[PDB]
Amino acid sequence: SKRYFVTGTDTEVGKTVASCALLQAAKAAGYRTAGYKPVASGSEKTPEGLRNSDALALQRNSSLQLDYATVNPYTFAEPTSPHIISAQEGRPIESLVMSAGLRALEQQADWVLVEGAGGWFTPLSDTFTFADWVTQEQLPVILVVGVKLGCINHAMLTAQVIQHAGLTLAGWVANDVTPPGKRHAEYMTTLTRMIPAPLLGEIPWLAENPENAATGKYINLALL
Amino acid sequence: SKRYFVTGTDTEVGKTVASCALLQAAKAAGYRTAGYKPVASGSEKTPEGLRNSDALALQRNSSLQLDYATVNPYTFAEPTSPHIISAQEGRPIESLVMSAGLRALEQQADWVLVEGAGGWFTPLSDTFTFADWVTQEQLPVILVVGVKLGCINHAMLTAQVIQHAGLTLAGWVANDVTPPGKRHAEYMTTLTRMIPAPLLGEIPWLAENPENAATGKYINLALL
Ligand SMILES: Nc1ncnc2c1ncn2[C@@H]1O[C@H](COP(=O)(O)OP(=O)(O)O)[C@@H](O)[C@H]1O
Ligand SMILES: Nc1ncnc2c1ncn2[C@@H]1O[C@H](COP(=O)(O)OP(=O)(O)O)[C@@H](O)[C@H]1O
Ligand SMILES: C[C@H](N)[C@@H](CCCCCC(=O)O)NC(=O)OP(=O)(O)O
Ligand SMILES: C[C@H](N)[C@@H](CCCCCC(=O)O)NC(=O)OP(=O)(O)O
Ligand SMILES: [Mg+2]
Ligand SMILES: [Mg+2]
Ligand SMILES: [Mg+2]
Ligand SMILES: [Mg+2]
Structure with missing residues (x-):
């Protein structure tokens, strides 16, 4: 069966909101x-x-x-x-x-x-990180990028380390953590060029309870 | 002559404040x-x-x-x-x-x-990043870590990519971007264990104009 590990460019960037969108899209596709x-x-x-x-x-x-x-x-x-x-x-x-x-x-x-x-690389013990477990399980990874200043560097660092570990970067999700800014389209173009995996979708800025918003529509599961 | 490239775990983490502290320490040591x-x-x-x-x-x-x-x-x-x-x-x-x-x-x-x-990895053009230039110049790198939630992952990602490029991680600087929190000492211990370079010093939280504060005293240049 299909399995994916969702990571992010940092904590507080949208892993959970994006994960709910991914789960909703998978349910719409007929998965259990x-x-x-x-x-x-x-x-x-x-x-x-x-x-x-x-x-x-x-x-x-x-x-x-x-x-x-x-x-x-x-x-x-x-x-x-x-x-x-x-x-x-x-x-x-x-x-x-x-x-x-x-x-x-x-x-x-x-x-x-x-x-x-x-x-x-979040540590789980003094000798074991989350990355070690994902590597052990050989899970394909989905990167959630919170679109903000500094996200290009974080996305590139994360993608490079995942690939070094011999793991597959299955795709990335753009998450609009704040209302639209001036260089949004240029940031999206740069992220699309630099991240070596398909952009699965972009979740818009949803102020009120985004975790329960109907967001599956923003993910194209056929690219995953 | 001695040359160092100062990078950070992100933008807005203290590269400039830490760089001023490093420069002040070098001046105190007798360098031009x-x-x-x-x-x-x-x-x-x-x-x-x-x-x-x-x-x-x-x-x-x-x-x-x-x-x-x-x-x-x-x-x-x-x-x-x-x-x-x-x-x-x-x-x-x-x-x-x-x-x-x-x-x-x-x-x-x-x-x-x-x-x-x-x-x-901040981009300078569509085909060239800051990392490419540092690699070309073969500069020893100093990592500024803004101490906050998520800094362990960012420090580890940055250190791993620097080492992969064949560059030397000369040291790291802890920068207290906010007042002291609960797990400050545990975060410092974890960062010290995980970053493969000497901790050069820790800059305390200095609310008013930290760029002009006398901060050279917080850096031990003999470890660099
Ligand atoms: N697209 C979105 N629009 C607006 N608010 C969002 C959106 N994405 C996340 N948030 C908010 O930002 C915070 C972090 O999002 P979360 O999914 O919990 O990130 P992480 O799981 O990486 O910690 C939460 O309070 C969440 O409700
Ligand atoms: N140790 C410190 N104590 C309190 N304020 C700090 C400290 N370090 C940095 N700052 C403030 O945080 C912001 C980012 O610091 P800066 O050195 O400019 O980071 P970066 O150069 O990585 O962008 C600035 O407004 C700076 O004055
Ligand atoms: C605007 C910000 N201050 C900075 C550039 C930030 C680039 C972010 C590229 C990315 O998204 O990774 N310009 C600057 O001159 O350097 P630092 O402030 O990080 O020192
Ligand atoms: C408290 C924060 N929310 C988080 C852990 C953050 C660990 C940071 C480890 C580091 O400094 O890199 N716990 C959580 O369960 O996961 P996310 O919120 O990032 O989804
Ligand atoms: Mg969270
Ligand atoms: Mg979460
Ligand atoms: Mg700055
Ligand atoms: Mg700066």
Whole structure:
């Protein structure tokens, strides 16, 4: 079955909004979809335990009815690097557990989207990064580019490191994090030339709750 | 003579403040210093022509009295990617001109600091990036890390790409862009472990005009 890892040019650039758009497009195409956020930091207390908003968005945008822990096995309250809060709470983040969770979703879904945390090299322990896990799993990567000053450099750095790891950069998504600026079209043209993967679509600036907006229409899944 | 290229984890992270600190430390060590900002975008009109604030800071922090054009040969008014404003104004950015300017500073200085624009891969034309020029010149690179969420990934991406190019990562500078946060010490420890170059110093959060603050004391030039 189809599996994709979604990374971003940084944290706070649109990975989650773009991931919901991708999931909606896959559902429209007839797939049995599932979103997976194996590691999440920055979560709120509920009667059932900690709940992360990215994980909730991926759960709500899956075509299948999935239990929260299946979408997000590792949940930390504080919004910092996973390795830091993991060490402080004495809750190791294990590659094998993250992989087992992906296999469990593949039991019922034929199209799985995995959202990373932060950018490409976010640490999970003092000797293991998210990039190490993606490399182990050999997942094709989708790059979410938050369109803003400095995004060209971040997109190029990320694309180069992914290719060096021997991984496939399956495509990129342009996310309009702010209202239209002066050099928007020139930035889009530059990003299109420089990123060695197909532009899958552009998500417009949607001020109010973009995670629940009908955004699947902005993704062309036939390019993926 | 000694020459260093200063890059950053992004634009707006402290390259200019850190570069002034480096220049001040070099002057205290007895060097005849010069700052060079070959390409600058985001400049103000004056009777003499456009003047960029980064270039002015580097000029003021040089031990030698340098003419503005020697510090910054290419000045563009609009604060966008250099390649975009260069193409619109029909003023090509030439590698040979940038290199000639560095040689001209080496006529009088024995310690030259070159500040880049934006991050590592900022484009200068549709076929040439700042990274291409640094590679041509074979300059040792100093990485300025703005300490904030997402800086670990950006520092690691930048360090990996520099090393891939066959260049030397001479050191890194921690810049406290905001007041102290909860995980400051853990972030510093992680950055120190992961960046394969000596930490040259840490510049504290200095709200008022940090470019003219006496910051040379925060750099240990014997580690460079
Ligand atoms: N296209 C969009 N239009 C407007 N707001 C957006 C859009 N994309 C993201 N946002 C907002 O920006 C912030 C970061 O987006 P998110 O998808 O959570 O990024 P990341 O997952 O990389 O952290 C969120 O508050 C989100 O609601
Ligand atoms: N250590 C510092 N403390 C407080 N303000 C800082 C500090 N470093 C940079 N700044 C401010 O942050 C902004 C970006 O810093 P600058 O050195 O110009 O970054 P870059 O050169 O990477 O664009 C500027 O307004 C600068 O005055
Ligand atoms: C707190 C932030 N939201 C994030 C982790 C950010 C890690 C930054 C690691 C670094 O400095 O590079 N946790 C999260 O679950 O993922 P994204 O929000 O980036 O999607
Ligand atoms: C406008 C900004 N200040 C800067 C260029 C930013 C280019 C961003 C190219 C990209 O998107 O990666 N011009 C400048 O002269 O250098 P720094 O301010 O980053 O020092
Ligand atoms: Mg986020
Ligand atoms: Mg997210
Ligand atoms: Mg700047
Ligand atoms: Mg600067």
